[PDB]
Amino acid sequence: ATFKVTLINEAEGTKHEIEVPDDEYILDAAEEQGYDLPFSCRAGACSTCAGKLVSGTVDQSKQSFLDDDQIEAGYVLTCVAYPTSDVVIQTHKEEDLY
Ligand code: FES
C-alpha cells in the first residue's frame, strides 16, 4: 500500500502532499520528496519531530517519548511513524506538549 499524507503547517499556512509507502516512515518520505521537517534524535525518543493527527491513523509503536494520554490526544512522532491509512497531520507541534 501507498498512503497519501497531507502535511499542514498552521503557523506558516502551508500544505504539502506526499505519498508514503506503508513500510516507510513519514519523515523519511517527506524528505525524499523535498520537504524538510524538524527532527533531532530520529529515534522516537524526543519531541522535536512531533506532529498532531487531524485524520487517519499511524503505527508509531517504536516511539518511547509520548505517554498514553498524549497519544490519545493525537500526537505523533513523525520520525518513527508509518501511515496505516491516508493521513492529515499538522507538523511542527512540539511546543504544544508544554
Ligand atoms: S526526532 Fe526525536 S522522536 Fe523524532
mmCIF file of C-alpha atoms and ligand atoms in Angstrom:
data_model
loop_
_atom_site.group_PDB
_atom_site.id
_atom_site.type_symbol
_atom_site.label_atom_id
_atom_site.label_comp_id
_atom_site.label_asym_id
_atom_site.label_seq_id
_atom_site.Cartn_x
_atom_site.Cartn_y
_atom_site.Cartn_z
ATOM 1 C CA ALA A 1 0.000 0.000 0.000
ATOM 2 C CA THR A 2 0.916 3.633 -0.507
ATOM 3 C CA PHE A 3 -0.748 6.330 1.563
ATOM 4 C CA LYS A 4 -1.458 9.939 0.892
ATOM 5 C CA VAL A 5 -0.099 12.168 3.595
ATOM 6 C CA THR A 6 -1.057 15.767 3.939
ATOM 7 C CA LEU A 7 1.340 17.922 5.861
ATOM 8 C CA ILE A 8 -0.090 21.082 7.301
ATOM 9 C CA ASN A 9 1.992 23.844 8.882
ATOM 10 C CA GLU A 10 -0.566 26.044 10.623
ATOM 11 C CA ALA A 11 1.838 28.765 11.656
ATOM 12 C CA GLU A 12 3.139 29.251 8.102
ATOM 13 C CA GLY A 13 -0.154 28.307 6.480
ATOM 14 C CA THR A 14 1.474 25.766 4.167
ATOM 15 C CA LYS A 15 0.313 22.441 2.874
ATOM 16 C CA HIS A 16 2.259 19.676 1.278
ATOM 17 C CA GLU A 17 1.005 16.470 -0.119
ATOM 18 C CA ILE A 18 3.189 13.374 -0.194
ATOM 19 C CA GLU A 19 2.818 9.649 -0.937
ATOM 20 C CA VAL A 20 4.197 7.248 1.605
ATOM 21 C CA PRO A 21 4.714 3.547 1.426
ATOM 22 C CA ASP A 22 3.200 1.547 4.266
ATOM 23 C CA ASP A 23 6.691 0.425 5.254
ATOM 24 C CA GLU A 24 8.372 3.854 5.195
ATOM 25 C CA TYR A 25 8.406 6.483 7.989
ATOM 26 C CA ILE A 26 6.620 9.711 7.295
ATOM 27 C CA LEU A 27 9.739 11.774 7.974
ATOM 28 C CA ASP A 28 11.854 9.942 5.500
ATOM 29 C CA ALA A 29 9.302 10.079 2.737
ATOM 30 C CA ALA A 30 8.788 13.791 3.258
ATOM 31 C CA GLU A 31 12.487 14.489 2.920
ATOM 32 C CA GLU A 32 12.816 12.309 -0.119
ATOM 33 C CA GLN A 33 10.018 14.176 -1.667
ATOM 34 C CA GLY A 34 11.674 17.561 -0.959
ATOM 35 C CA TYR A 35 10.060 18.695 2.220
ATOM 36 C CA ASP A 36 12.346 19.153 5.229
ATOM 37 C CA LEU A 37 10.736 18.682 8.605
ATOM 38 C CA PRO A 38 12.082 19.190 12.141
ATOM 39 C CA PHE A 39 13.959 16.370 13.901
ATOM 40 C CA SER A 40 16.761 15.670 16.356
ATOM 41 C CA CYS A 41 17.144 12.122 17.676
ATOM 42 C CA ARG A 42 15.375 10.325 14.785
ATOM 43 C CA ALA A 43 14.704 7.571 17.221
ATOM 44 C CA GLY A 44 11.390 8.161 18.823
ATOM 45 C CA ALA A 45 12.841 9.469 21.998
ATOM 46 C CA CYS A 46 12.302 13.150 21.813
ATOM 47 C CA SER A 47 9.687 15.625 20.885
ATOM 48 C CA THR A 48 11.373 17.548 18.117
ATOM 49 C CA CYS A 49 9.564 15.807 15.250
ATOM 50 C CA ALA A 50 6.085 15.949 16.831
ATOM 51 C CA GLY A 51 3.015 16.319 14.757
ATOM 52 C CA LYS A 52 -0.702 16.212 15.514
ATOM 53 C CA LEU A 53 -3.145 13.977 13.642
ATOM 54 C CA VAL A 54 -6.068 15.673 12.032
ATOM 55 C CA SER A 55 -7.358 12.464 10.426
ATOM 56 C CA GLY A 56 -6.148 8.936 9.601
ATOM 57 C CA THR A 57 -4.043 6.597 11.611
ATOM 58 C CA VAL A 58 -0.426 5.558 12.002
ATOM 59 C CA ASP A 59 1.748 2.922 13.501
ATOM 60 C CA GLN A 60 4.304 4.587 15.842
ATOM 61 C CA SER A 61 4.931 1.553 18.060
ATOM 62 C CA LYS A 62 8.676 2.217 18.022
ATOM 63 C CA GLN A 63 8.116 5.537 19.917
ATOM 64 C CA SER A 64 9.047 5.895 23.560
ATOM 65 C CA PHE A 65 8.679 9.545 24.372
ATOM 66 C CA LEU A 66 4.890 10.158 24.376
ATOM 67 C CA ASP A 67 2.662 8.849 27.096
ATOM 68 C CA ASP A 68 -0.750 7.189 26.584
ATOM 69 C CA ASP A 69 -2.662 10.397 27.056
ATOM 70 C CA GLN A 70 -0.560 12.263 24.535
ATOM 71 C CA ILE A 71 -1.102 9.530 22.022
ATOM 72 C CA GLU A 72 -4.821 9.502 22.643
ATOM 73 C CA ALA A 73 -4.744 13.214 22.061
ATOM 74 C CA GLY A 74 -3.406 12.596 18.545
ATOM 75 C CA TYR A 75 0.290 13.433 18.892
ATOM 76 C CA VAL A 76 2.728 11.541 16.678
ATOM 77 C CA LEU A 77 6.496 11.258 16.422
ATOM 78 C CA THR A 78 6.987 11.596 12.681
ATOM 79 C CA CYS A 79 10.473 10.097 12.655
ATOM 80 C CA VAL A 80 9.155 6.644 13.626
ATOM 81 C CA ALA A 81 5.565 6.754 12.335
ATOM 82 C CA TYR A 82 4.267 4.579 9.487
ATOM 83 C CA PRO A 83 0.975 5.605 7.919
ATOM 84 C CA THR A 84 -1.753 2.932 8.194
ATOM 85 C CA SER A 85 -4.333 4.963 6.200
ATOM 86 C CA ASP A 86 -4.418 8.216 4.349
ATOM 87 C CA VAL A 87 -3.440 10.814 6.919
ATOM 88 C CA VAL A 88 -3.767 14.509 7.572
ATOM 89 C CA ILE A 89 -1.280 15.847 10.003
ATOM 90 C CA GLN A 90 -0.218 19.163 11.489
ATOM 91 C CA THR A 91 3.571 19.475 11.727
ATOM 92 C CA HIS A 92 5.858 21.481 13.994
ATOM 93 C CA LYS A 93 3.711 20.764 17.005
ATOM 94 C CA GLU A 94 6.432 20.294 19.612
ATOM 95 C CA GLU A 95 5.592 23.497 21.525
ATOM 96 C CA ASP A 96 2.096 22.026 22.161
ATOM 97 C CA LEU A 97 3.336 19.496 24.759
ATOM 98 C CA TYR A 98 4.311 22.204 27.336
HETATM 99 S S1 FES B 1 13.299 13.326 16.187
HETATM 100 FE FE1 FES B 1 13.313 12.574 18.265
HETATM 101 S S2 FES B 1 11.412 11.421 18.401
HETATM 102 FE FE2 FES B 1 11.539 12.062 16.310
#
